[PDB]
PDB file of C-alpha atoms in Angstrom:
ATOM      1  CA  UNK A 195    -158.731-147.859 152.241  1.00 22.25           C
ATOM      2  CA  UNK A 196    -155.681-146.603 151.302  1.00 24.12           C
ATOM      3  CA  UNK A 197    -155.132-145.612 155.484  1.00 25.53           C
ATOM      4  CA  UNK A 198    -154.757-149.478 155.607  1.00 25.78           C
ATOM      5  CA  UNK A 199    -151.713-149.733 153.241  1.00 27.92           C
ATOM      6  CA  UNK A 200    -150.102-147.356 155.878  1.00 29.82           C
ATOM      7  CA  UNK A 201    -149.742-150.259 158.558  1.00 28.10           C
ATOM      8  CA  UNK A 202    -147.540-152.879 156.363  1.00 26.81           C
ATOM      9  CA  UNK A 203    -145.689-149.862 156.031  1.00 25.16           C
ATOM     10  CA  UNK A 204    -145.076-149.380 159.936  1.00 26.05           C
ATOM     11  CA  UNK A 205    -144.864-153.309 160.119  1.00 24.90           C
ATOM     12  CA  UNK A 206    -145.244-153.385 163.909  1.00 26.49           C
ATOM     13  CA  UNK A 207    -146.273-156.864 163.114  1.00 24.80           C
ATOM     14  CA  UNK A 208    -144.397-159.097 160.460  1.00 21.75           C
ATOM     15  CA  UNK A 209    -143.151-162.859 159.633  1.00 22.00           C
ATOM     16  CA  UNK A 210    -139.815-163.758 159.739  1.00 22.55           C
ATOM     17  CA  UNK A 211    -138.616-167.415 160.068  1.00 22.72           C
ATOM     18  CA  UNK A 212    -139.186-170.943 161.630  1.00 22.39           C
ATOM     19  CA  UNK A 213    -138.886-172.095 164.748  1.00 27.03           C
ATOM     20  CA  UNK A 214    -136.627-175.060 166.087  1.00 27.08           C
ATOM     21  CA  UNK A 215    -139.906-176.729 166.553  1.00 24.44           C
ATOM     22  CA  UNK A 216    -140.937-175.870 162.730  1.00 20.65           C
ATOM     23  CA  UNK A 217    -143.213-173.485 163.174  1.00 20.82           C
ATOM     24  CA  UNK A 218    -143.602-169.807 161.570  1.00 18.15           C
ATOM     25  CA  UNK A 219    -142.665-166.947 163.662  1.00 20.96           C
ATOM     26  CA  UNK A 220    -144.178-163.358 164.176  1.00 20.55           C
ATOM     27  CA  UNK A 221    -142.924-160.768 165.365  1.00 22.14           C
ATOM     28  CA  UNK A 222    -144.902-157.629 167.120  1.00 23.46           C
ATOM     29  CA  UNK A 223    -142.979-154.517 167.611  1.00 25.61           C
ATOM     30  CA  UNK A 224    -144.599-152.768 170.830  1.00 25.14           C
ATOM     31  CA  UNK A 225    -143.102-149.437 170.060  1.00 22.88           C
ATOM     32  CA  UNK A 226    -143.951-149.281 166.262  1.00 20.64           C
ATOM     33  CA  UNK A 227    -147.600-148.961 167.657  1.00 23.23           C
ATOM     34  CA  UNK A 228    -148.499-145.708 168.864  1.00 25.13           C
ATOM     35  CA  UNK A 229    -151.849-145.192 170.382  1.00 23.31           C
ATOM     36  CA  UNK A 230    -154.716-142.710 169.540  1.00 24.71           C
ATOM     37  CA  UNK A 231    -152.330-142.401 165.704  1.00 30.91           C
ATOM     38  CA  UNK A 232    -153.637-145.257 163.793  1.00 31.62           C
ATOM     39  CA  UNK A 233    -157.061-147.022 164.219  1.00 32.14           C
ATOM     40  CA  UNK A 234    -156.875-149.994 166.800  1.00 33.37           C
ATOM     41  CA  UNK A 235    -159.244-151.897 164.206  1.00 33.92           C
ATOM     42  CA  UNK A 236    -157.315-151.390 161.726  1.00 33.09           C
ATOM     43  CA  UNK A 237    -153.575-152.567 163.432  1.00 30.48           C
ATOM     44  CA  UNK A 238    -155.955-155.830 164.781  1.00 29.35           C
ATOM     45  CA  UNK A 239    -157.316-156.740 161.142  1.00 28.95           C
ATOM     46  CA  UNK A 240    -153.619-156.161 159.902  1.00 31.88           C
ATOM     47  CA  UNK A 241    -152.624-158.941 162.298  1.00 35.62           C
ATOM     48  CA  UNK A 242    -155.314-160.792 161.354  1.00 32.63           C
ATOM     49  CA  UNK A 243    -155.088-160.792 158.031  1.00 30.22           C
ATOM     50  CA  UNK A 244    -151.024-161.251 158.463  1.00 30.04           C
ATOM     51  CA  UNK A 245    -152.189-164.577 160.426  1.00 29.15           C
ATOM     52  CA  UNK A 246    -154.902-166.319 158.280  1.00 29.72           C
ATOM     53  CA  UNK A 247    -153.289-168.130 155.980  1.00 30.50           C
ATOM     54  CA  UNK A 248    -151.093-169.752 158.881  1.00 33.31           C
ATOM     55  CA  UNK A 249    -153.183-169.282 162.073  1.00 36.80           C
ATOM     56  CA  UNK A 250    -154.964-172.755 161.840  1.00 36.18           C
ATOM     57  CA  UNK A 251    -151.855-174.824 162.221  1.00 35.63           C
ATOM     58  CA  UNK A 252    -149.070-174.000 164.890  1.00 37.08           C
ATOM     59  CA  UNK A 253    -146.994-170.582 165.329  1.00 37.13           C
ATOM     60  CA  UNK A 254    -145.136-168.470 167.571  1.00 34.25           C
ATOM     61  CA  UNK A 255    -144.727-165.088 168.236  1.00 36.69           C
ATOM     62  CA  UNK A 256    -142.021-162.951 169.252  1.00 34.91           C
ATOM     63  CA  UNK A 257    -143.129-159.673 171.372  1.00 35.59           C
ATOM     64  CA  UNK A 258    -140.155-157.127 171.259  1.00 37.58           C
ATOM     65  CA  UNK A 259    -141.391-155.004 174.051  1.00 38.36           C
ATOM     66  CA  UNK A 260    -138.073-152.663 173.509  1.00 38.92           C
ATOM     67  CA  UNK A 261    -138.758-148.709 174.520  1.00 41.49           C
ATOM     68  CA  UNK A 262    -142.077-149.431 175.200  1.00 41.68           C
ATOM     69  CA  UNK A 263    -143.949-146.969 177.197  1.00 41.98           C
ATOM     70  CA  UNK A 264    -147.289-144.904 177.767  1.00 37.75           C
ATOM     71  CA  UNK A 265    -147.636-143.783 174.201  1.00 38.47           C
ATOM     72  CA  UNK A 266    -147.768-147.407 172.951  1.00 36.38           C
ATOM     73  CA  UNK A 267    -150.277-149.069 175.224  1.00 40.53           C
ATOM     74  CA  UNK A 268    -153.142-150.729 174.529  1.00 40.48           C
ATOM     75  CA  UNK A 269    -155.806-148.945 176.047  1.00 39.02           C
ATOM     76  CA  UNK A 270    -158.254-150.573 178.864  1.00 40.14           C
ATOM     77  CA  UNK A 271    -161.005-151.365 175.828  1.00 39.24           C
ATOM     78  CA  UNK A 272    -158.716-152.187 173.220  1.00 39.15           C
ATOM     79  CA  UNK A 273    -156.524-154.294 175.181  1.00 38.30           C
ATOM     80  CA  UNK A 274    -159.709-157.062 175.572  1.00 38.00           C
ATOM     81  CA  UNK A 275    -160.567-156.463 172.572  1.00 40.25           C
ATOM     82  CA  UNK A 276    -157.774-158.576 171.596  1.00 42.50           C
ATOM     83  CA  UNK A 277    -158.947-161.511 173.380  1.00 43.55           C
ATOM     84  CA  UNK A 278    -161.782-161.600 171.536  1.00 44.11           C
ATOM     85  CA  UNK A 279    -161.471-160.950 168.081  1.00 45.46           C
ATOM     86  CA  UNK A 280    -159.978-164.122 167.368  1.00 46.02           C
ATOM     87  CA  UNK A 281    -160.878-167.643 166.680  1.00 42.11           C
ATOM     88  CA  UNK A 282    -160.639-169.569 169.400  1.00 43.93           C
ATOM     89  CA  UNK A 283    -158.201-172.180 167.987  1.00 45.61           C
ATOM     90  CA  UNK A 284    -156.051-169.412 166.698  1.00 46.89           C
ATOM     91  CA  UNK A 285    -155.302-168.474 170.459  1.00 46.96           C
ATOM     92  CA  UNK A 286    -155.097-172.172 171.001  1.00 47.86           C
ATOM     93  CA  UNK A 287    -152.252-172.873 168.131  1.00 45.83           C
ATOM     94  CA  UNK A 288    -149.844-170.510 169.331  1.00 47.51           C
ATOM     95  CA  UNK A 289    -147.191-172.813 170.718  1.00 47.01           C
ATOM     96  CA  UNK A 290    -144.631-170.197 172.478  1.00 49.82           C
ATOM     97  CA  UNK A 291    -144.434-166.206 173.099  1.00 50.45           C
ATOM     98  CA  UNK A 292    -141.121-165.084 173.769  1.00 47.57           C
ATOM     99  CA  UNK A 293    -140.981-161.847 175.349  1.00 50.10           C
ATOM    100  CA  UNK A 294    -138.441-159.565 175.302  1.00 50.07           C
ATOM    101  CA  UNK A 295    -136.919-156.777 176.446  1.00 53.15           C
ATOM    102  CA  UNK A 296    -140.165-156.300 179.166  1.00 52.34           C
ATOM    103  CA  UNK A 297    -139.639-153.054 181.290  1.00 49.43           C
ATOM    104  CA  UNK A 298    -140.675-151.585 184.037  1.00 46.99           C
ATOM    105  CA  UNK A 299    -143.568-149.796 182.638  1.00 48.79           C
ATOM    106  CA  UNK A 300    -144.755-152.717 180.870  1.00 51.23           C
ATOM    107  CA  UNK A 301    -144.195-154.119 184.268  1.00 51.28           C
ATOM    108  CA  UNK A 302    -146.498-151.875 186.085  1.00 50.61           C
ATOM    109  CA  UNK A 303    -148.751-152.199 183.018  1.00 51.55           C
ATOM    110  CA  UNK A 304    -149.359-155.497 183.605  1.00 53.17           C
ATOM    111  CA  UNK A 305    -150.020-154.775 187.620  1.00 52.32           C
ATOM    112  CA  UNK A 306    -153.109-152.287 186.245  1.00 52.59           C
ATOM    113  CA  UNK A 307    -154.659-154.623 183.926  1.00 49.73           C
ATOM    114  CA  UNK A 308    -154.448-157.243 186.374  1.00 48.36           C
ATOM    115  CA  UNK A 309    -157.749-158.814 185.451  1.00 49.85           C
ATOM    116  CA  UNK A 310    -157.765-158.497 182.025  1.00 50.60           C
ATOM    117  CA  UNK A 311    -154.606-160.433 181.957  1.00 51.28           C
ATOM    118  CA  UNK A 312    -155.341-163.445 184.467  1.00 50.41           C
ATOM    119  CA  UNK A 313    -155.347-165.646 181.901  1.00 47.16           C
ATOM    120  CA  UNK A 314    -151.509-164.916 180.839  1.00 51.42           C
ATOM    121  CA  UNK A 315    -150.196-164.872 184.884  1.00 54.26           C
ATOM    122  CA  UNK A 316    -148.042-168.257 185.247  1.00 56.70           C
ATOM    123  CA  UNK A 317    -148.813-169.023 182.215  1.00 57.70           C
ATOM    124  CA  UNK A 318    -146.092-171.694 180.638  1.00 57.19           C
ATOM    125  CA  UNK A 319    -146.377-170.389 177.406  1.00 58.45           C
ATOM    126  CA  UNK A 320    -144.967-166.924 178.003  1.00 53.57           C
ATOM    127  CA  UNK A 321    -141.270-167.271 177.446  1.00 53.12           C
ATOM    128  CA  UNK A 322    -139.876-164.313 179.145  1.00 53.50           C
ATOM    129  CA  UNK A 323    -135.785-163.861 177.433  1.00 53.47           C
ATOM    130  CA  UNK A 324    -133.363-163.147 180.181  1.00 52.14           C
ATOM    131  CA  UNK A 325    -130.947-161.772 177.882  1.00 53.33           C
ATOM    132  CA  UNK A 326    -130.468-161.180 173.383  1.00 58.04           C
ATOM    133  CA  UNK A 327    -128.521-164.881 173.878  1.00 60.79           C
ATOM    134  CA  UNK A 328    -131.297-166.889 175.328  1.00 63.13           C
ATOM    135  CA  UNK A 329    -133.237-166.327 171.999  1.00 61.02           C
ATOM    136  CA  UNK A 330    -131.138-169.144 170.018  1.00 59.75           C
ATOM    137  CA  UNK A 331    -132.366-171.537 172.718  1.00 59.67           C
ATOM    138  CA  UNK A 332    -135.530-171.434 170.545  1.00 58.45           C
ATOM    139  CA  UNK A 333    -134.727-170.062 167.338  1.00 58.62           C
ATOM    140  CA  UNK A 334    -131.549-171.051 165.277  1.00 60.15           C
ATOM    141  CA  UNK A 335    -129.465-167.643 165.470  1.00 61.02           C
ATOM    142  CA  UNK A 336    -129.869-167.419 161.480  1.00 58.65           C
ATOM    143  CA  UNK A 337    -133.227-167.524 161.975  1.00 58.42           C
ATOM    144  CA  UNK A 338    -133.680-164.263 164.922  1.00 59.16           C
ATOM    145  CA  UNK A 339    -135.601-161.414 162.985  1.00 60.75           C
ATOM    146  CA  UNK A 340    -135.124-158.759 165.339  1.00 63.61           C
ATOM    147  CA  UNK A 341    -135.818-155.220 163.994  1.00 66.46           C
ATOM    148  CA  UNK A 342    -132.124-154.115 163.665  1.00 63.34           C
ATOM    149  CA  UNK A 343    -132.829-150.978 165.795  1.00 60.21           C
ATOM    150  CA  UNK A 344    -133.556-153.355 168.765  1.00 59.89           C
ATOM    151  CA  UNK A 345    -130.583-155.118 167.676  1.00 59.05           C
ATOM    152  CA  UNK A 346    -127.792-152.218 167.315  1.00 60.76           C
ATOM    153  CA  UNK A 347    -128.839-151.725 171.439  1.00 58.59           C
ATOM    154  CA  UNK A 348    -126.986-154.598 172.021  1.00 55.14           C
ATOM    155  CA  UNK A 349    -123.250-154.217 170.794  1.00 55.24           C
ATOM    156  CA  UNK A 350    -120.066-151.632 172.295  1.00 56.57           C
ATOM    157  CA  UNK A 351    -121.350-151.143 176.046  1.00 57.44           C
ATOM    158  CA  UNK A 352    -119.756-149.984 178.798  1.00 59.02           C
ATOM    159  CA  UNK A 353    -121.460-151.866 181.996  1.00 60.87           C
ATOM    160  CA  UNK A 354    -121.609-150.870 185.448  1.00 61.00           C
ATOM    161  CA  UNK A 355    -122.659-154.105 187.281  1.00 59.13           C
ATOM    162  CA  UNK A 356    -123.840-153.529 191.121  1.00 60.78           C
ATOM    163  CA  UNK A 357    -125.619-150.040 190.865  1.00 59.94           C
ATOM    164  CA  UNK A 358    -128.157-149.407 192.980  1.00 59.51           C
ATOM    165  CA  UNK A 359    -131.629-147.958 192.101  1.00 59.29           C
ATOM    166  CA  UNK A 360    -132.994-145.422 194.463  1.00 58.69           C
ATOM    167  CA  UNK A 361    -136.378-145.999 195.486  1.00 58.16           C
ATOM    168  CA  UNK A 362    -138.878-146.517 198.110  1.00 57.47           C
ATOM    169  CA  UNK A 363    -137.503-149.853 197.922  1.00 53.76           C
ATOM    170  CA  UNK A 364    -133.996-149.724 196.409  1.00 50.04           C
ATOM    171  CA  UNK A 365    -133.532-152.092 193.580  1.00 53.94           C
ATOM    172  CA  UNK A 366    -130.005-154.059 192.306  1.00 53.45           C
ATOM    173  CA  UNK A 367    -129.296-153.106 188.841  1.00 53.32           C
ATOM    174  CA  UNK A 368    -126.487-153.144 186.067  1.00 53.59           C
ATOM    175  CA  UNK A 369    -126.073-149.457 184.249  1.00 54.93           C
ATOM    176  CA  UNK A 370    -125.114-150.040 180.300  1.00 52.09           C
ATOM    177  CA  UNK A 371    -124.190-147.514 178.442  1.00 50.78           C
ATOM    178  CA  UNK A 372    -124.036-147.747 174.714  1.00 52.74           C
ATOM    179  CA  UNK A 373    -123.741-145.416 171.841  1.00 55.76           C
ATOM    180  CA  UNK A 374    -126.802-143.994 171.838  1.00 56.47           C
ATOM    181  CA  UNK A 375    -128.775-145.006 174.920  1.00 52.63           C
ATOM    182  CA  UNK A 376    -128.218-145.955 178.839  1.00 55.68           C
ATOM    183  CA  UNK A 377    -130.099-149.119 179.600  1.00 56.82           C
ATOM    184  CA  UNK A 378    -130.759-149.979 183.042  1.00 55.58           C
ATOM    185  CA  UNK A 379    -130.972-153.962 183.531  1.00 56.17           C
ATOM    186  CA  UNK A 380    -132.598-155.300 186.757  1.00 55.49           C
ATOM    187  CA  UNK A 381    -132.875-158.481 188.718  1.00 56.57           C
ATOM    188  CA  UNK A 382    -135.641-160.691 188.965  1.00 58.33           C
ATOM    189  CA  UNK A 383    -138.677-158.955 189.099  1.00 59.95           C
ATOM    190  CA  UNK A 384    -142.319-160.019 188.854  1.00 57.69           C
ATOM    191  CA  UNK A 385    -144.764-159.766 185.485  1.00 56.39           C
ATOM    192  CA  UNK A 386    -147.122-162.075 185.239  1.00 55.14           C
ATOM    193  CA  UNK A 387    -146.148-164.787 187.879  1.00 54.69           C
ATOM    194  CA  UNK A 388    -143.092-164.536 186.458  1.00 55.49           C
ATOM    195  CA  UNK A 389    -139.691-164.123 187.411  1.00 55.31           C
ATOM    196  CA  UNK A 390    -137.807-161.765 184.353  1.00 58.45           C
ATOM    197  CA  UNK A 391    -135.093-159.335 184.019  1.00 58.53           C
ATOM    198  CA  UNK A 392    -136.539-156.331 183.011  1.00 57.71           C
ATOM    199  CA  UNK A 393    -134.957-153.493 180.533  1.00 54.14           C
ATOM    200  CA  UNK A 394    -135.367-150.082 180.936  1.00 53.75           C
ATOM    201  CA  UNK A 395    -134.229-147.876 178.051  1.00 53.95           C
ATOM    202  CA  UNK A 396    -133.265-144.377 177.927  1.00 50.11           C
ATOM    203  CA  UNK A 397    -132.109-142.875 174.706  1.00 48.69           C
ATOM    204  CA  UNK A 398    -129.312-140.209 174.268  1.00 52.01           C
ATOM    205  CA  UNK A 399    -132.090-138.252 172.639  1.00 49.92           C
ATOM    206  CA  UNK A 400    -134.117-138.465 176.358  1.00 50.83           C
ATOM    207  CA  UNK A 401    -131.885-137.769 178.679  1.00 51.78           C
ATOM    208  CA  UNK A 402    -132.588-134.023 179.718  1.00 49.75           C
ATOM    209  CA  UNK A 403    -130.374-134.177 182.420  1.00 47.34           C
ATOM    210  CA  UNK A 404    -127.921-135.759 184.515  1.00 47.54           C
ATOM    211  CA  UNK A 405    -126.178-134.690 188.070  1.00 45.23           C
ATOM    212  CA  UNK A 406    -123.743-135.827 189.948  1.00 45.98           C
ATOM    213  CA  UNK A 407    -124.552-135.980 193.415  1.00 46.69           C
ATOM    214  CA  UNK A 408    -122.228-137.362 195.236  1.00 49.12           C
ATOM    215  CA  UNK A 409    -118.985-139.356 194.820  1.00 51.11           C
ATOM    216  CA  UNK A 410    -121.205-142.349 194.951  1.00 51.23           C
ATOM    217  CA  UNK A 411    -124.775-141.139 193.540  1.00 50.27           C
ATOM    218  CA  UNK A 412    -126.365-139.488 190.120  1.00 50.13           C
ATOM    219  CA  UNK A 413    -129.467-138.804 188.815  1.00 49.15           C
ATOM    220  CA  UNK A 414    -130.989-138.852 185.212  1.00 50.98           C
ATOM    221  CA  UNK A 415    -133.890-136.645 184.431  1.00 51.80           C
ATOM    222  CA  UNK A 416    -136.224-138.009 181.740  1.00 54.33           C
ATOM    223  CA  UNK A 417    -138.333-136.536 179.297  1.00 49.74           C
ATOM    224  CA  UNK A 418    -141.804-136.871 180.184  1.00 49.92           C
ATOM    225  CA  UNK A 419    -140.979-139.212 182.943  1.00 49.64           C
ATOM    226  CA  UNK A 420    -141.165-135.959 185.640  1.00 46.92           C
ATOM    227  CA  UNK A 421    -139.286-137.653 188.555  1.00 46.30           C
ATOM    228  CA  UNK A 422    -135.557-137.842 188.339  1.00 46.51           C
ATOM    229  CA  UNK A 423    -133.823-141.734 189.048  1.00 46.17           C
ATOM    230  CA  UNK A 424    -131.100-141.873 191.227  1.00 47.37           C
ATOM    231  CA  UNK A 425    -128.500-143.826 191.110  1.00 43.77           C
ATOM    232  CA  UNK A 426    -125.979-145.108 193.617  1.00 45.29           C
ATOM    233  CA  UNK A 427    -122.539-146.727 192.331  1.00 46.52           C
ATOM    234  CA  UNK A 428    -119.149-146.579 193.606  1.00 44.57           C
ATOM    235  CA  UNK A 429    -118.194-145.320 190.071  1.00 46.81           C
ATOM    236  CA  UNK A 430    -120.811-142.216 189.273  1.00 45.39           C
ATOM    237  CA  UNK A 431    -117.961-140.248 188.489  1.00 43.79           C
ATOM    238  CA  UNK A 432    -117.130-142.120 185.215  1.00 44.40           C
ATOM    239  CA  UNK A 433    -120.778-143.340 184.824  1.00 46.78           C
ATOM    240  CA  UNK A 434    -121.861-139.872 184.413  1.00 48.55           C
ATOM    241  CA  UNK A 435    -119.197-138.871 182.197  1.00 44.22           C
ATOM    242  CA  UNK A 436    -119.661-141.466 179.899  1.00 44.48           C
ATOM    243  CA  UNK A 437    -123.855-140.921 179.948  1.00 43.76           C
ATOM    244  CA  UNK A 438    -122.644-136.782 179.124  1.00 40.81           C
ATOM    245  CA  UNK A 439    -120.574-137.823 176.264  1.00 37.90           C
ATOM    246  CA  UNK A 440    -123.202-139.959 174.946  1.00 39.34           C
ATOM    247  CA  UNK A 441    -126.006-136.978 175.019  1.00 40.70           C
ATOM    248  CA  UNK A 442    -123.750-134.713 173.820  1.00 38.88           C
ATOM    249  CA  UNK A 443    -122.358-136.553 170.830  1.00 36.24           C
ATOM    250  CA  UNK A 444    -126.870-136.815 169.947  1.00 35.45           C
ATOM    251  CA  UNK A 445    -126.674-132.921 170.626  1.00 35.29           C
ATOM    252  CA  UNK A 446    -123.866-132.239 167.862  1.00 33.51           C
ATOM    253  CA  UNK A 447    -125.532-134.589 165.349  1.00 33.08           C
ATOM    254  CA  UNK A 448    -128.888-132.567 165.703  1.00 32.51           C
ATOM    255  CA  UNK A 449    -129.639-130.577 162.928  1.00 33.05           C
ATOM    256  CA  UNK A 450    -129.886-127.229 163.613  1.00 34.28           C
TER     257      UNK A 450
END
């Protein structure tokens, strides 16, 4: 009952414009959804009863998989639950599924749910969104319904292009920093049979610490992420300074 009235309030799923193929767009918000807090059902019928009255002709979706981690996944029995639930012509009608923002996490995601996902790998209808431009190339600018936190990510950053992510295998990456979060861009990586550039993002309000190693190397501590990255750039000096003065101006504005 009146639990239900809570979801339209979270609107992790909403319209919001046409397509330059004329068809209505919807947009899930991956983070907005936070599992084992609201009833799985519930979010499911919400979409479902968002995509009735259009779900027998043609539509697209946008999946804004900004920030999202752990604490927003679907879980094993919910997440085929999904492919279930619907009619089978309402999977059928959905013309395009731009993705964006996809992470590492959502990344690895996808690795354990392999075979719940088979279906999706190569599949020509996932439109994976290199970068906030590539959007237009499908929907008219005027038209990009974006929640405007995913949005303010995008505008006064300082990049480092040609860092280096430490791992067993180290990875090419770009280092943004922005007002209030670092976001750490990589080249193409796999999801899906895809090639994408995946997003990582680390808010100010995350960042627990950061050390400067060497001249050349840093490393950012996470919350709840437990091991450290590590960074190697020919800059770290001013990378680091800028990531501190980015924490520290969230510190100040805390209250209390």
């Amino acid at each position: 009952k009146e639990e239900f009235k809570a979801l339209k309030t979270l609107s992790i799923f909403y319209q919001a414009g046409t397509s330059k193929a004329g068809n209505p767009i919807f947009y899930y918000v991956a983070r907005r959804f936070k599992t084992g807090q609201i009833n799985g059902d519930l979010l499911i019928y919400h979409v479902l009863l968002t995509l009735k009255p259009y779900y027998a002709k043609p539509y697209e979706i946008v999946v804004d998989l900004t920030h999202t981690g752990p604490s927003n996944r679907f879980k094993t029995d919910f997440l085929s639950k999904w492919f279930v639930v619907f009619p089978g012509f309402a999977y059928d009608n959905v013309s395009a599924v731009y993705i964006y923002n996809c992470n590492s996490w959502v990344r690895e995601y996808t690795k354990y749910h392999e075979r719940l996902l088979t279906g999706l790998k190569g599949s020509k209808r996932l439109v994976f969104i290199d970068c906030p431009g590539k959007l237009a190339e499908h929907i008219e600018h005027e038209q990009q319904k974006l929640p405007a936190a995913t949005l303010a990510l995008e505008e006064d950053l300082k990049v480092f292009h040609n860092a280096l992510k430490l791992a067993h295998k180290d990875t090419k990456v770009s280092i943004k920093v922005g007002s209030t979060a670092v976001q750490v861009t990589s080249a193409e990586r796999t999801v899906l049979g895809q090639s994408v550039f995946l997003n990582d993002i680390y808010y100010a309000s995350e960042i627990e610490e950061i050390c400067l190693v060497d001249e050349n190397q840093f490393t950012l501590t996470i919350a709840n992420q437990g091991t450290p990255l590590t960074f190697m750039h020919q800059e770290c000096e001013a990378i680091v300074q800028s990531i501190i003065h980015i924490r520290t101006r969230w510190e100040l504005s805390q209250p209390d």
